Symmetry: D2
Subunit: 115 residues, 4 copies
């Protein structure tokens, strides 16, 4: 995987399972083209979004449907979603892990970029 | 302030000063309309973005220009920006503090909502 | 204040009110001596712990009783407490804000140090 | 592994490698008994600290030498270390992952507790 998404639940201390994730690529006309999507697994991970052939340089947006996740647990969330926007591969393909730690009124996101 | 933004630098343990912040409100046609903008002060806070009359119900997006902040410090950060999207004032007028804590490859954002 | 502690609740998006906080300073014999204590106010802040005369160089430990906080809300949290340990005033007198952001299975802590 | 530690670097966007980690168990006389230790691998993970035979109920402290890690990178850290203190297995053995996300003036820690 050149791009992996991992989501954690800070209220329950568990992976965040069945979280919808959409990935977009910035088109030339500055709009967001859908690129890939899925739902986090039981380990809160989403693999196989793209291939390194397809994952070329550009600006990508990862949208995490945090609101539906909290709605499903019966907990009021603040955010509509969590967005992560970044420029990829600007020094060559590496592997990207986008981690997100979710609370109802707070989230953090971290990129782990390795060889 | 019905809406205040506060940004901290986790590398230096300081307010993040002169960070540009753009606020948008989602219109009837589902486009983002520019709502307010400003920059954080020496305390890392941005006050006076709006008024309670102007700050009606809606979906708002606060876009914090973290990239320019890190670049001006010689750092090439992961994220293009930190975006915070939320429904405001749905159950009546509230006061919102949007906090952001910045690291070059990570950020967190927290909402404090008071009545 | 040379030393202020501020605690937020990430589940409710509010200050964390009435949170007990104990401060210790490491003595010559490497034991922790009680230094100051208090509880967070309605704003989630604890002021007036010490004075600049009393707040000499040393290693300090701020222990935030997060467990009692969550328990009183019916939540069984992961952590016994959040402990923050740091050398203070090594290059001269500074003002320290120790922020903590609390979730039942996660917390973050940030220092803001100003001169 | 009934207990695993994972450390990430929020400045470099990478696992935090060669971070010293000590695990303690609270003795009957309220002092901390060393229990296990190691250094994070190239993936920022530390496995094989204990066995489920040995990892009985009790209060455990995980001390992460964040200060040496930042010193090794030539970056001034605020904290002496990061401590995580928690009661284990209080409803039966599960698997514990203690994750820590490190910045020079800020850290977060999260417990991922699974079956
Ligand atoms: Ca993968
Ligand atoms: Ca204000
Ligand atoms: Ca309404
Ligand atoms: Ca004060
Ligand atoms: Ca000194
Ligand atoms: Ca393991």
């Amino acid at each position: 995987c050149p791009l992996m998404v991992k989501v954690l639940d800070a209220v329950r201390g568990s992976p965040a399972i069945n979280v919808a994730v959409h990935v977009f690529r910035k088109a030339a006309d500055d709009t967001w083209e859908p690129f890939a999507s899925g739902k986090t697994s039981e380990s809160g991970e989403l693999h196989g979004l793209t291939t390194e052939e397809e994952f070329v340089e550009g600006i990508y947006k990862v949208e995490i449907d945090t609101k539906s996740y909290w709605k499903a647990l019966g907990i009021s969330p603040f955010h509509e979603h969590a967005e992560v926007v970044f420029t990829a591969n600007d020094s060559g393909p590496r592997r990207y892990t986008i981690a997100a730690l979710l609370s109802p009124y707070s989230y953090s996101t971290t990129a782990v970029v390795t060889n």
